[PDB]
Design a protein around this nucleic acid. Structure first.
Ligand SMILES: [Zn+2]
Lengths: 176, 38, 207, 145, 59
RNA sequence: GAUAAACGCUGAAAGCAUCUAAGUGUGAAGCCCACCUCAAGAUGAGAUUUCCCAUUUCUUUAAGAAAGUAAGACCCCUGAG
RNA sequence: GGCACCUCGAUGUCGGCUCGUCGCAUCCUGGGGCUGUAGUCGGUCCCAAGGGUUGGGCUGUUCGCCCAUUAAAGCGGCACG
């Protein structure tokens, strides 16, 4: 598994323990605990880690990839954390936040809000950009999804919410 | 979606993917190609 | 929660403060002693026994007068329960006057329907007669009994049998007055029961 | 007529056993149980006298269903009315009413007459982890069957 | 008689086949009816026979 | 509350892509609760409050037979909500 | 349409009336994907059987043509109930 045969290069300030399957990863911000299959031989050597495993996985090659990818996810998350940036077109759309509320004005009669769990916050520069930040990749992704889910774009004029580098085709429909 | 008994890739980019007891065909270029065997 | 039994006197009218006649029935009541408090640790749930009228003394027996006398009253006629009531808040031998329903305005009266004896299959289901002329002979009967293939009669074919005598509740009625000096409520609309029957009134269920 | 042992009514002595169900497929647990109940394994077998034992089943929540049948073995019922076919349950009864499970998956594998009913009330099944019947000193069985 | 030999024998770790097989191998020829009767009453003797059979197909 | 078509998040076998095998969500007048009624002959015959407490011979002392009562119920009579 | 096993010591046809019930290859309402979908309308395909599905003129009529409404005026099985 070329993905289950890379390195785990720990960053500064990293503690990793083992209690049962529970291999927690702690550091500057992270205190995460995931699960890992019972056919995983962890490694040693401060910050230089890999994953030897008794192979013959499900089809000789499956579990390795998800496991090493997820541990590298743990590491990168505890180190800094992630982002998902959103834009906004559709003249007349704004967004304002006071802590764990995100009001949204995107054409409905009544403005849509959004709560927030703990490990995530929102950093609103202006009325046309949002930025999610957190620890996990999954949770950042899910909240960004839920937010885009309020009004995905439209391929005629370009309204709705987008990611930044997301592409959207435009069907040049005639005017009547 | 086009749901047909027989399923074939129609672009060059199309790919054949199994997700469940079914056989998809996904094409990021055009949308007219999502084929799911049924 | 708010629960009261009572009699049923009849119906009359009442003008409101804006010149508008309103049909109104007269649910009469009297004080009534909570008789027993059923708890989780003893009876599996929480409820309250009540009773609305006064028997004579000749018309009871030692079990009844030994089951009441833990609250020191004359033996009662009716005894019912109530659920979902905030238990607390109560005692053995208290009372429940008509105060609890000042202008509750939403209430679900129950009671027992009238009685109509053996009845045909039209006064019970609205089934329609057959052509009373043009030579027919099928005036007033319950139709056919089904198909042939199954060689039996399906359940729930409806035909003659005693009509009325089973309980039924109405929902979302208002209240108009509470004359505590005589223990009388006045609600809007039609309420089921025969005169002098037994009625119960609780707060709404559909908020 | 000649000499062959025919058990009387009361001479037969019954015992009490306790069987676990932790990670065992439904079928085989039920099979062993049903064999024990009818009176077999006792050489005093008689096919009209009820020489059975008493069974008590523990942990009826941790019983195992192999592959699917977690969401496919659909039970059924019918209320003898038009359109009454209520297939309500699934392999979800493991959660709720877990007594119902074994109390069908065994009340099937028995005979279908009175003997096959009075031979069923000797069942006692508990989804929990401990029984109230210490009044009668039950023992334990093992399963390599 | 077969079911009764089943019940009794199985208790000695001899399946209801292997018992009969070993018996008809050690050249012992008891009739089932007598085997059932013995299994029900004379447990010591039945166990003796089961021991001989165990020895028999052990060869 | 759990799901259908559909839509994802994260992630590899296949250094990429990719909703799935491990993990993790949204989602319908439909499924199961919610509303109204019947319901312990549910022979797996449920629970609670209150009331009433002991003669004669022996069959032989056994889940014996018989007689008079308590609590209560019924018979009989005036009626109908 | 075919065959002639079934009923000749007798197995009564079409429509309409009263009464229903079930399947879904769905007519309306409900959820979806694509569009040669600007909007309002629409086309097709998918999930879905919970409920609902009109009065009258003409013929013995099924069938059908017509008038006036409606969210819609479904197709079939049950001895062509
Ligand atoms: Zn393509």
């Amino acid at each position: 598994s070329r993905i289950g045969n890379k390195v785990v290069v720990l960053p500064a300030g990293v503690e990793i323990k083992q209690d049962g399957n529970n291999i927690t990863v702690k550091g500057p911000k992270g205190e995460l605990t995931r699960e890992f299959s019972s056919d995983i031989k962890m490694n040693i050597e401060g910050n230089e880690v890999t994953f030897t495993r008794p192979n013959d996985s499900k089809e000789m090659k499956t579990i390795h990839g998800t496991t090493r990818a997820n541990f590298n996810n743990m590491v990168v998350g505890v180190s800094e954390g992630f982002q998902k940036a959103l834009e906004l077109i559709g003249v007349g759309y704004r967004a304002q936040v006071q802590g764990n509320k995100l009001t949204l004005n995107v054409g409905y009669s009544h403005p849509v809000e959004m709560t927030a769990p703990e490990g995530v916050t929102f950093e609103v520069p202006a009325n046309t950009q949002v930025i999610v930040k957190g620890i996990n990749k999954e949770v950042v992704g899910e909240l960004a999804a839920n937010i885009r889910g309020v009004r995905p774009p439209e391929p005629y004029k370009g309204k709705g919410i987008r990611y930044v580098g997301e592409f959207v085709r435009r069907k040049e429909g005639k005017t009547g | 979606m086009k749901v047909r008994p027989s399923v074939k890739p129609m672009c060059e980019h199309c790919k054949v993917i199994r997700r469940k007891g079914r056989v998809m065909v996904i094409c990021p270029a055009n949308p007219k190609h999502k084929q799911r065997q049924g | 929660t708010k629960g009261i039994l009572g009699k049923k006197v009849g119906m009359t009218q009442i003008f409101t403060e804006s010149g508008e006649l309103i049909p109104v029935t007269v649910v009469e009541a009297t004080p009534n002693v909570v008789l027993q408090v059923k708890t989780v640790e003893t009876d599996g749930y929480e409820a309250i026994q009540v009773g609305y009228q006064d028997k004579r003394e000749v018309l009871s027996n030692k079990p009844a007068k030994g089951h009441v006398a833990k609250a020191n009253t004359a033996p009662k006629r009716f005894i019912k329960e109530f659920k979902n009531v905030e238990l607390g808040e109560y005692e053995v031998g208290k009372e429940i006057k008509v105060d609890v329903f000042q202008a509750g305005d939403v209430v679900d009266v129950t009671g027992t329907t009238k009685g109509k004896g053996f009845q045909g299959a039209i006064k019970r289901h609205g089934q329609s007669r057959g052509p009373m002329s043009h030579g027919s002979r099928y005036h007033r009967r319950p139709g056919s009994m089904g198909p042939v293939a199954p060689n039996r009669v399906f359940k729930n074919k409806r035909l003659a049998g005693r009509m009325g005598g089973d309980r039924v509740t109405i929902q979302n009625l208002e209240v108009v007055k509470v004359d505590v000096e005589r223990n009388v409520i006045l609600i809007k609309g039609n309420i089921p029961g025969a005169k002098k029957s037994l009625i119960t009134i609780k707060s709404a269920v559909k908020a | 007529m000649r000499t062959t042992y025919m058990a009387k009514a009361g001479e037969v002595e019954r015992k009490w056993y306790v069987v676990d169900a932790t990670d065992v497929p439904l079928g085989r647990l039920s099979a062993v149980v049903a064999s024990v109940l009818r009176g077999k394994n006792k050489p005093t077998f008689t096919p009209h006298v009820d020489t059975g034992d008493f069974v008590i089943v523990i942990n009826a929540d941790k019983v195992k269903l192999t592959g699917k049948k977690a969401t496919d073995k659909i039970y059924y019922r019918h209320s003898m009315y038009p359109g009454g076919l209520k297939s309500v349950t699934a392999g979800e009864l493991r959660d709720k009413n877990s007594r119902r499970l074994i109390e069908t998956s065994v009340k099937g594998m028995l005979p279908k007459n009175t003997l096959g009913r009075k031979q069923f009330t000797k069942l006692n099944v508990y989804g929990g982890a401990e029984h109230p019947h210490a009044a009668q000193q039950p023992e334990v069985l093992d399963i390599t069957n | 008689w077969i079911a009764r030999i089943n019940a009794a024998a199985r208790m000695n770790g001899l399946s209801y086949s292997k018992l009969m097989h070993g018996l008809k191998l050690a050249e012992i020829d008891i009739n089932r009816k007598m085997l059932a009767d013995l299994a029900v009453n004379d447990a010591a003797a039945f166990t003796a026979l089961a021991e001989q059979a165990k020895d028999a197909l052990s060869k």
